[PDB]
Design an enzyme around this catalytic site. Structure first.
Site, PDB file in Angstrom:
ATOM      1  N   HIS A  78       0.780  -1.222   0.000  1.00 56.57           N
ATOM      2  CA  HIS A  78       0.000   0.000   0.000  1.00 56.57           C
ATOM      3  C   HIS A  78       0.824   1.291   0.000  1.00 56.57           C
ATOM      4  O   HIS A  78       0.744   2.148   0.892  1.00 56.57           O
ATOM      5  CB  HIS A  78      -1.018  -0.054   1.087  1.00 56.57           C
ATOM      6  CG  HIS A  78      -2.123  -1.023   0.807  1.00 56.57           C
ATOM      7  ND1 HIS A  78      -2.206  -2.253   1.445  1.00 56.57           N
ATOM      8  CD2 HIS A  78      -3.165  -0.955  -0.069  1.00 56.57           C
ATOM      9  CE1 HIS A  78      -3.297  -2.867   0.998  1.00 56.57           C
ATOM     10  NE2 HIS A  78      -3.889  -2.110   0.082  1.00 56.57           N
ATOM     11  N   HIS A 118      -6.363   7.227  -3.212  1.00 57.99           N
ATOM     12  CA  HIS A 118      -7.266   6.305  -2.593  1.00 57.99           C
ATOM     13  C   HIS A 118      -6.688   5.490  -1.431  1.00 57.99           C
ATOM     14  O   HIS A 118      -7.469   4.906  -0.679  1.00 57.99           O
ATOM     15  CB  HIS A 118      -7.957   5.343  -3.601  1.00 57.99           C
ATOM     16  CG  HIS A 118      -7.143   4.137  -3.925  1.00 57.99           C
ATOM     17  ND1 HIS A 118      -6.015   4.193  -4.726  1.00 57.99           N
ATOM     18  CD2 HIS A 118      -7.234   2.857  -3.473  1.00 57.99           C
ATOM     19  CE1 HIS A 118      -5.484   2.977  -4.782  1.00 57.99           C
ATOM     20  NE2 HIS A 118      -6.210   2.158  -4.048  1.00 57.99           N
TER      21      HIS A 118
HETATM   22  C1  LIG Z   1     -11.192 -15.976  -0.425  1.00 54.86           C
HETATM   23  C2  LIG Z   1      -9.921 -16.682   0.071  1.00 54.86           C
HETATM   24  C3  LIG Z   1      -9.846 -18.091  -0.518  1.00 54.86           C
HETATM   25  C4  LIG Z   1      -8.689 -15.868  -0.330  1.00 54.86           C
HETATM   26  C5  LIG Z   1      -8.710 -14.484   0.246  1.00 54.86           C
HETATM   27  O1  LIG Z   1      -8.358 -13.523  -0.404  1.00 54.86           O
HETATM   28  N1  LIG Z   1      -9.219 -14.365   1.566  1.00 54.86           N
HETATM   29  C6  LIG Z   1      -9.226 -13.037   2.218  1.00 54.86           C
HETATM   30  C7  LIG Z   1     -10.318 -12.163   1.632  1.00 54.86           C
HETATM   31  O2  LIG Z   1     -11.066 -12.642   0.777  1.00 54.86           O
HETATM   32  N2  LIG Z   1     -10.309 -10.852   1.968  1.00 54.86           N
HETATM   33  C8  LIG Z   1     -11.049  -9.868   1.173  1.00 54.86           C
HETATM   34  C9  LIG Z   1     -10.032  -9.054   0.395  1.00 54.86           C
HETATM   35  C10 LIG Z   1      -9.095  -8.360   1.367  1.00 54.86           C
HETATM   36  N3  LIG Z   1      -8.152  -7.471   0.644  1.00 54.86           N
HETATM   37  N4  LIG Z   1      -7.318  -8.113  -0.201  1.00 54.86           N
HETATM   38  C11 LIG Z   1      -6.593  -7.419  -1.001  1.00 54.86           C
HETATM   39  C12 LIG Z   1      -5.653  -8.170  -1.877  1.00 54.86           C
HETATM   40  C13 LIG Z   1      -4.918  -7.582  -2.912  1.00 54.86           C
HETATM   41  C14 LIG Z   1      -4.077  -8.355  -3.709  1.00 54.86           C
HETATM   42  C15 LIG Z   1      -3.962  -9.732  -3.489  1.00 54.86           C
HETATM   43  O3  LIG Z   1      -3.173 -10.625  -4.177  1.00 54.86           O
HETATM   44  C16 LIG Z   1      -2.502 -10.298  -5.308  1.00 54.86           C
HETATM   45  F1  LIG Z   1      -3.350  -9.787  -6.253  1.00 54.86           F
HETATM   46  F2  LIG Z   1      -1.661  -9.293  -5.023  1.00 54.86           F
HETATM   47  C17 LIG Z   1      -4.689 -10.324  -2.429  1.00 54.86           C
HETATM   48  O4  LIG Z   1      -4.491 -11.674  -2.366  1.00 54.86           O
HETATM   49  C18 LIG Z   1      -4.621 -12.569  -1.363  1.00 54.86           C
HETATM   50  F3  LIG Z   1      -5.289 -12.121  -0.329  1.00 54.86           F
HETATM   51  F4  LIG Z   1      -5.401 -13.537  -1.814  1.00 54.86           F
HETATM   52  C19 LIG Z   1      -5.509  -9.538  -1.625  1.00 54.86           C
HETATM   53  C20 LIG Z   1      -6.776  -5.910  -1.161  1.00 54.86           C
HETATM   54  C21 LIG Z   1      -7.903  -5.644  -2.150  1.00 54.86           C
HETATM   55  C22 LIG Z   1      -8.534  -4.293  -2.029  1.00 54.86           C
HETATM   56  C23 LIG Z   1      -8.300  -3.474  -1.032  1.00 54.86           C
HETATM   57  C24 LIG Z   1      -7.362  -3.785   0.086  1.00 54.86           C
HETATM   58  C25 LIG Z   1      -7.054  -5.295   0.212  1.00 54.86           C
HETATM   59  C26 LIG Z   1      -8.138  -6.111   0.883  1.00 54.86           C
HETATM   60  O5  LIG Z   1      -8.972  -5.617   1.628  1.00 54.86           O
HETATM   61  C27 LIG Z   1      -8.406  -9.358   2.296  1.00 54.86           C
HETATM   62  C28 LIG Z   1      -9.459 -10.214   2.991  1.00 54.86           C
HETATM   63  C29 LIG Z   1      -9.729 -15.444   2.315  1.00 54.86           C
HETATM   64  O6  LIG Z   1     -10.021 -15.302   3.489  1.00 54.86           O
HETATM   65  C30 LIG Z   1      -9.891 -16.763   1.605  1.00 54.86           C
HETATM   66 MG   LIG Z   2      -7.614   0.842   0.125  1.00 58.26          MG
HETATM   67 ZN   LIG Z   3      -5.792   0.167  -3.031  1.00 60.16          ZN
END
Ligand SMILES: CC1(C)CC(=O)N(CC(=O)N2CCC(N3N=C(c4ccc(OC(F)F)c(OC(F)F)c4)[C@H]4CC=CC[C@H]4C3=O)CC2)C(=O)C1
Ligand SMILES: [Mg+2]
Ligand SMILES: [Zn+2]
Ligand code: NI
EC number: 3.1.4.53
Length: 329
Positions: A78, A118
């Protein structure tokens, strides 16, 4: 009055600014860690936003450098490179054929400014973490979209610094409309709003109307702002749709950030948040799940809205998903 050689190499990379897949990390290196400033400046010139909004160029540059300095270089994901990426991705999405001549210059300015601010001053932990630690941010915002409220407040506050008021020549009506749209867009980047945004995007696809040479018809604020909100939200969730070399760096960075949070949660006896536990991680399986439950569903719906413009983006996403699936032990 001629560019230095490094400035020339940077200007050459910036020729990819209208392409999905721009080498943003390389831009960051070539610009002396100023990818947000140089990408914003390029986009503003490209879209003629300085002339349209009577933005003095020194004021723009001063604001942009100030904004970029309020992103933390010690946060792995971030940071200013992520901000620059979301800006550039929004800029590409705004240029999609299905939206040609749909949005006004003020709406365009809103989407791009929103993208730029943002995540400003992001501390590299989640809203839930801030809430559970009794952090000052959480207290200030009553636990409600804590980070996103803060990003807005900082982004707008910075306009008051010396020679930073890029909107100084806008009328009060333009500023009020701009401010409202920017607020609506940044608040929509809180992942707790994802299911509602996606539900509304789906409804819009189901009732889609096309018109002025086959572009979308958006005839009320609620539909116009929903599209822009989902557009920036797509950009924010765009990492898995990019070429694998870019995607993997983003994954490394987000995992570093998540694992640092988990270390802090472990050390303090707190429950470790989803995917923050480096001792119980499945990086590959998590990406596949993130793609299956969040990123694909959104991008598939966006691709329907703008059909067929986003087909190569959706194909890249599906290819990357297969790649991560295939590396699972
Ligand atoms: C569904 C599951 C099988 C896998 C999984 O994700 N979670 C956690 C989950 O669903 N969440 C919701 C998204 C949240 N989150 N996640 C971000 C993010 C960005 C890039 C990522 O990887 C790659 F592209 F770089 C990434 O990958 C990794 F998490 F998979 C996550 C951001 C998105 C927007 C705003 C702020 C960041 C934000 O809020 C985190 C929590 C599960 O629990 C299980
Ligand atoms: Mg954000
Ligand atoms: Zn962002
Ligand atoms: Ni810092």
């Amino acid at each position: 009055g001629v560019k230095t050689e490094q400035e020339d190499v940077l200007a050459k990379e910036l020729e990819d600014v209208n392409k999905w897949g721009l080498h943003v990390f390389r831009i960051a290196e070539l610009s002396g860690n100023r990818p947000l400033t140089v990408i914003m400046h390029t986009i503003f010139q490209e879209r003629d936003l300085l002339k349209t909004f009577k933005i003095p160029v020194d004021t723009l540059i001063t604001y942009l450098m100030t904004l970029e300095d309020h992103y933390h270089a010690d946060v792995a994901y971030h940071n200013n490179i992520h901000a620059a990426d979301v800006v550039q991705s929004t800029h590409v999405l705004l240029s999609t054929p299905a939206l040609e001549a749909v949005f006004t210059d003020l709406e365009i300015l809103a989407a791009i400014f929103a993208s730029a601010i943002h995540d400003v001053d992001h501390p590299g932990v989640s809203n839930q973490f801030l809430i559970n630690t009794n952090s000052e941010l959480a207290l200030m915002y009553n636990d409600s979209s804590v980070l996103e409220n803060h990003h807005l407040a900082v982004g707008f506050k910075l306009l008051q610094e010396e020679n930073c008021d890029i909107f100084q020549n806008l009328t009060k009506k333009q500023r009020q409309s701009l401010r409202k749209m920017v607020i609506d867009i940044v608040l929509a980047t809180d992942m707790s709003k994802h299911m509602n945004l996606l539900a509304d995007l789906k409804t819009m696809v189901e009732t889609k109307k096309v018109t002025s040479s086959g572009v979308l018809l958006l005839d009320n604020y609620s539909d116009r702002i929903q599209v822009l909100q989902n557009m920036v939200h797509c950009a924010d969730l765009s990492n898995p749709t990019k070429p694998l070399q870019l995607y993997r760096q983003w994954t490394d960075r987000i995992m570093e950030e998540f694992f640092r949070q988990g270390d802090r949660e472990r050390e303090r006896g707190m429950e470790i948040s989803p995917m923050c536990d480096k001792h119980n991680a499945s990086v590959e399986k998590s990406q596949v799940g993130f793609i299956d439950y969040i990123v694909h569903p959104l991008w598939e719906t966006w691709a329907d809205l703008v059909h067929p413009d986003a087909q190569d983006i959706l194909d890249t996403l599906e290819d990357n998903r297969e790649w991560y699936q295939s590396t699972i032990p």
